[PDB]
Ligand binder design. Structure first.
Ligand SMILES: Clc1cccc(OCc2nn[n-]n2)c1
Ligand SMILES: Clc1cccc(OCc2nn[n-]n2)c1
Ligand SMILES: [Zn+2]
Length: 257
């Protein structure tokens, strides 16, 4: 029964998931004047040409777009990563108002939303094994600012009224996640965790510097989803983000100068 409310939100998670107060929790604030350019980072390789999307699901916390990860069809390699990471799903975190919603912040700036493309290290064979390893996942994070519409998001926005409530799903084939990326792949990277329970410390975070722009109409539609199931009282799916956690003994590295 974790969630994002006053009574079951981020401040309560540690009682069921004590790793909530661990040494490598996410998200963090990215202090752009303390991050250091690392000339050793190899270039980032986002290979989504063969991506096979399947389904979109409201899981009561966000909506997830799921991919076929039974072969190397959509992979992330390079940058800080060793080996090959398979795209399994993406989802977003967003706010009730345009001034909040992202999980990562940039010099304490909150964006309206944040997209997470989740990938797992194929040397571990399956997702459930990968999340038990310190290098099991790579999450590519992309900020959303409100401005011009993002055409490659509109197929997502248009389907949300079919999955309004928890447990609803819809076919979501033939969706190209390349349409969600910004132009630049400049990024920050640091070792961290899942940002929801179980909060496992298994993620290499790769957060793109360049946000994408979405329209106020597009993000407004995110906010019409529901955390509740059908035939329950309505609780709008807004503010499904965890705030910044202590950086502790970690360094955030920049791919760019
Ligand atoms: Cl939605 C989208 C966005 C950006 C690039 C895309 O395809 C690029 C490509 N890959 N192979 N030929 N063109 C597709
Ligand atoms: Cl497949 C998956 C597994 C666990 C958590 C997920 O989404 C929330 C999250 N964790 N880190 N960034 N977002 C997604
Ligand atoms: Zn996420």
């Amino acid at each position: 029964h974790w969630g994002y409310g006053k009574h079951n939100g981020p401040e309560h998670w540690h009682k069921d998931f004590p790793i909530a107060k661990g040494e490598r929790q996410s998200p963090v604030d990215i202090d752009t004047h303390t991050a250091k350019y690392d000339p050793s980072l190899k270039p980032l390789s986002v290979s989504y040409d063969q991506a096979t999307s399947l389904r979109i699901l409201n899981n009561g916390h966000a909506f997830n777009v799921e991919f076929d990860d039974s072969q190397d069809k959509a992979v992330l390699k390079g940058g800080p990563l060793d080996g090959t990471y398979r795209l399994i799903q993406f989802h977003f975190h967003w706010g009730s108002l345009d001034g909040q919603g992202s999980e990562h912040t940039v010099d304490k700036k909150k964006y309206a939303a944040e997209l997470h493309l989740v990938h797992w290290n194929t040397k571990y064979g399956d997702f459930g094994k990968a999340v038990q390893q310190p290098d099991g996942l790579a999450v590519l994070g992309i900020f959303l600012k409100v401005g011009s519409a993002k055409p490659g998001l509109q197929k997502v926005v248009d389907v949300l009224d079919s999955i309004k409530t928890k447990g609803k799903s819809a076919d979501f084939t033939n969706f190209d996640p390349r349409g969600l990326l910004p132009e630049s792949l400049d990024y920050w990277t640091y070792p961290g965790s899942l940002t929801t329970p179980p909060l496992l410390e298994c993620v290499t975070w790769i957060v793109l510097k360049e946000p994408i722009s979405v329209s106020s109409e597009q993000v407004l539609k995110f906010r019409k989803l529901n955390f509740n199931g059908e035939g329950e009282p309505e609780e709008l799916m807004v503010d499904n983000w965890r705030p910044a956690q202590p950086l502790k003994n970690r360094q955030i590295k920049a791919s760019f100068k």
